[PDB]
Design a protein around this ligand. Structure first.
Ligand SMILES: [Ca+2]
Ligand SMILES: [Ca+2]
Ligand SMILES: [Ca+2]
Ligand SMILES: [Ca+2]
Ligand SMILES: [Ca+2]
Ligand SMILES: [Ca+2]
Lengths: 116, 183
């Protein structure tokens, strides 16, 4: 399977009405990263980061992973789908209770470095 | 009287009353006229009037069934009913078809799909090359265009979203299930 144009459109962070409900949203708006990495390699590297940075794997499934840290302060759901023969779409939904930090300095830069 | 709107939508009377609280907040945000204008709708969706979006443009148009460019509570409630988890799927398929028919002259056409792919990739800062976008759109039409005319008609749209239900995820707001506690 390869995702189609309407997966891109319908899942875009601004193409829904969730903003109407403000703080009721559990996760921040989805952050998407398009990469030529394989899903298996993305998961492998995430597991290395989990081991190095004192995180927890809440879920590891065919669709991706849920990673937690900091005694309930941080969580992210990472979904990986094939976009083209060459590229995956990585969708990251995260929440952070507290206002450098894990997400800014380590996790988000990892996703950015995947991009290609 | 909330009983009329409750009868006509999949909301209960209590849910209509909760929805009215949300409506009052949105409608008073820029001009205090008891109505939701486009700017107020953008503020509700995005928390800023600086995000100009074809999704906002299309959805506001489809909410504004009495097409005076401003929303009353009946328009707001009937439109949001479409997004309730228990709304008829046929309503979600119809609304989304009309949404994605950007030029409002029938069909979801290749140019409309491409405009939306380019815009949505830009929301994520993932501005893929034209050859990649064309490949993705090719594959989309390969699957969807069973009545082979190079355009997606309402029956073809129905088939695609029945086949891949996640394509309708933006046509449901799970938050509407808990509206009475939030509001
Ligand atoms: Ca107003
Ligand atoms: Ca504006
Ligand atoms: Ca119109
Ligand atoms: Ca109106
Ligand atoms: Ca059209
Ligand atoms: Ca066709």
């Amino acid at each position: 399977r390869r995702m189609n144009a309407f997966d891109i459109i319908s899942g875009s962070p601004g193409f829904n009405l969730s903003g109407l409900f403000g703080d009721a949203r559990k996760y921040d708006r989805v952050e998407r990263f398009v990469s030529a990495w394989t899903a298996e390699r993305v998961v492998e590297r995430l597991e290395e980061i989990v081991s190095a940075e004192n995180l927890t794997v809440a879920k590891k499934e065919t669709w991706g992973m849920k990673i937690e840290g900091q005694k309930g302060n941080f969580a992210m759901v990472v979904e990986i789908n094939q976009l083209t023969d060459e590229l995956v779409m990585i969708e990251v939904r995260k929440r952070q209770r507290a206002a450098r930090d894990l997400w800014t300095d380590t996790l988000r830069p990892f996703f950015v470095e995947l991009v290609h | 009287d909330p009983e009329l709107l409750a009868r006509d939508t999949v909301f209960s009377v209590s849910e209509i009353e909760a929805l009215y609280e949300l409506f009052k907040k949105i409608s008073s945000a820029v001009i205090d006229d008891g109505l939701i204008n486009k700017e107020e709708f953008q503020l509700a969706l995005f928390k800023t009037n600086k995000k100009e979006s074809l999704f906002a443009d299309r959805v506001f148009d489809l909410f504004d069934t009495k097409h005076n460019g401003i929303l009353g509570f009946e328009e707001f409630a009937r439109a949001l009913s479409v997004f309730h988890p228990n709304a008829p799927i046929d309503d979600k398929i119809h609304f989304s078809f009309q949404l994605y028919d950007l030029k409002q002259q029938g069909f979801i056409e290749r140019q409309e799909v491409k405009q939306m792919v380019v815009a949505t990739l830009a929301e994520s800062g993932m501005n893929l090359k034209d050859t990649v976008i064309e490949d993705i759109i090719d594959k989309t039409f390969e699957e969807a265009d069973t009545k082979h005319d190079g355009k997606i008609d309402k029956e073809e749209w129905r088939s695609l979203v029945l086949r891949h239900p996640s394509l309708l995820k933006n046509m449901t707001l799970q938050y509407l299930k808990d509206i009475t506690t939030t509001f």
